[PDB]
CSV table of C-alpha atoms in Angstrom, one decimal:
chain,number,residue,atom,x,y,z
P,745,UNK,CA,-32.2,44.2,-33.2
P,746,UNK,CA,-33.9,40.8,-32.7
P,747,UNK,CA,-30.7,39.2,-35.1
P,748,UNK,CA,-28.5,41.2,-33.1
P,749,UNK,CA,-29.9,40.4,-29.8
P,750,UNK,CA,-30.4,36.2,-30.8
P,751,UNK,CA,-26.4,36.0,-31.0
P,752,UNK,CA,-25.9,35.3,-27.3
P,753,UNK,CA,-28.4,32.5,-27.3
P,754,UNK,CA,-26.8,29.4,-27.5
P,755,UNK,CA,-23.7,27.8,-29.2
P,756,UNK,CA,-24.2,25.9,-32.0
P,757,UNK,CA,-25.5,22.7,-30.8
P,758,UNK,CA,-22.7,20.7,-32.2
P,759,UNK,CA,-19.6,22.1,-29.9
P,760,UNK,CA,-21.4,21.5,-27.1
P,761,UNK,CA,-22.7,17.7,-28.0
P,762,UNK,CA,-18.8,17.4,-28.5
P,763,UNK,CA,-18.0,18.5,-25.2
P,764,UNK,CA,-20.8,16.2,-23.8
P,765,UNK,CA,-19.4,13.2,-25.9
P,766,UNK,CA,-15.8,13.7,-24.5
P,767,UNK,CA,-16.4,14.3,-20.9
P,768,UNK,CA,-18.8,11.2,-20.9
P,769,UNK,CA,-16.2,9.3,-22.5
P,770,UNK,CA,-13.1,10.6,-20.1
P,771,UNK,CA,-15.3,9.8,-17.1
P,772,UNK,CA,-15.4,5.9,-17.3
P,773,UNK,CA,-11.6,6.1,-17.7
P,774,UNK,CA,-11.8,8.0,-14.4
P,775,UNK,CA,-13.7,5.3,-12.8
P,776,UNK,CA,-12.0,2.0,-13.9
P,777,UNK,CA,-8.1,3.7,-12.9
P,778,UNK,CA,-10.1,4.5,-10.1
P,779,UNK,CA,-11.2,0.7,-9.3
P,780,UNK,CA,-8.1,-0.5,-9.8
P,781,UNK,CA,-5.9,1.8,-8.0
P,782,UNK,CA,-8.5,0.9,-4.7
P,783,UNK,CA,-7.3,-2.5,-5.9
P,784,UNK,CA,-3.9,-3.3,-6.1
P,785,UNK,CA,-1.2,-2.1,-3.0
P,786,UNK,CA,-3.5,-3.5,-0.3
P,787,UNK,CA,-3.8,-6.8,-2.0
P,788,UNK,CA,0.0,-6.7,-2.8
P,789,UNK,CA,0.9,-6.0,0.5
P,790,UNK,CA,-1.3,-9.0,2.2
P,791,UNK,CA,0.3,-11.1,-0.3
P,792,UNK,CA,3.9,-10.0,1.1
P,793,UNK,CA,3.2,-10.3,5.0
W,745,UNK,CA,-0.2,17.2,3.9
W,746,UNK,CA,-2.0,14.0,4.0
W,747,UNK,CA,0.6,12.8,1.9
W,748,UNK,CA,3.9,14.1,4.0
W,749,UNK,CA,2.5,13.1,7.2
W,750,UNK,CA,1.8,9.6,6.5
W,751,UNK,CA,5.4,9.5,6.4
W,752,UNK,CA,6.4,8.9,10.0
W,753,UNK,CA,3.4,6.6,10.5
W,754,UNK,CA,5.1,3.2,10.3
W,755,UNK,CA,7.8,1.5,8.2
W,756,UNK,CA,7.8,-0.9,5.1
W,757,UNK,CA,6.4,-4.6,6.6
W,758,UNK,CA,9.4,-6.0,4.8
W,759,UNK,CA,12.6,-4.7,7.2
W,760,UNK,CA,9.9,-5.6,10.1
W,761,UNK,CA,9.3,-9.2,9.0
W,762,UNK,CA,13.2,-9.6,8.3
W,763,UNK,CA,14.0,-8.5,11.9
W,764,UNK,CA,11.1,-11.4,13.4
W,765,UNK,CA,12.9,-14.0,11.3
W,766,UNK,CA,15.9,-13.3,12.1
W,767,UNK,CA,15.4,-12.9,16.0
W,768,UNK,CA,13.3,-16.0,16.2
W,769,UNK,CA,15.9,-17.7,14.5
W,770,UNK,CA,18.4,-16.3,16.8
W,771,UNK,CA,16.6,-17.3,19.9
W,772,UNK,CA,16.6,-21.0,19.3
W,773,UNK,CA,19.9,-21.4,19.2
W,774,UNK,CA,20.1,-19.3,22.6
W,775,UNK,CA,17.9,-21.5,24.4
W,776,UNK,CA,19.7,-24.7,23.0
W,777,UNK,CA,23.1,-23.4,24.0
W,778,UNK,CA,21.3,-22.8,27.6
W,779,UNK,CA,20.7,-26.2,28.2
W,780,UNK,CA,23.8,-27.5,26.7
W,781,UNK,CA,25.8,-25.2,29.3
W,782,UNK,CA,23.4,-26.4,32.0
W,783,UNK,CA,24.5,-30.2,31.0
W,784,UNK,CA,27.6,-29.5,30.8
W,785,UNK,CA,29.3,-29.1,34.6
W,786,UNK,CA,28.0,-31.1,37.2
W,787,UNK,CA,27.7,-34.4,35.2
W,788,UNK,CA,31.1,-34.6,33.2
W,789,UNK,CA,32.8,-33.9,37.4
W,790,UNK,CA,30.6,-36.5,38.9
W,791,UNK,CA,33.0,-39.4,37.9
W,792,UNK,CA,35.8,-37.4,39.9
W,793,UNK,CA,35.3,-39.9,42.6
């Protein structure tokens, strides 16, 4: 019962590290589209008028 | 929502910046004409007699 019951502990730590690894990576992608898009149209547009 | 009501906001600066030019333009050549048509009566009948 103490195998059965020590199956709903964790995952195996590996799947989750690879979860970890891909979100922190995906973020930074987030945040430079992010910097630019604040960037561009405004800047753009003041060069037009 | 945000999106579809900044629609009747204001226009592109483009059309708006065409239309100054072109009535600034316009309006020189108004007041020039003016003063031409002011020149022109009095002093080309003076030399009647």
């Amino acid at each position: 019962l103490t195998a059965a019951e020590s199956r709903i502990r964790d995952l195996d730590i590996a799947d989750e590290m690879a979860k970890f690894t891909k979100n922190q990576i995906l973020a930074q992608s987030n945040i430079s589209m992010l910097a630019q898009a604040n960037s561009l149209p405004q800047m753009a547009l003041s060069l037009l008028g």
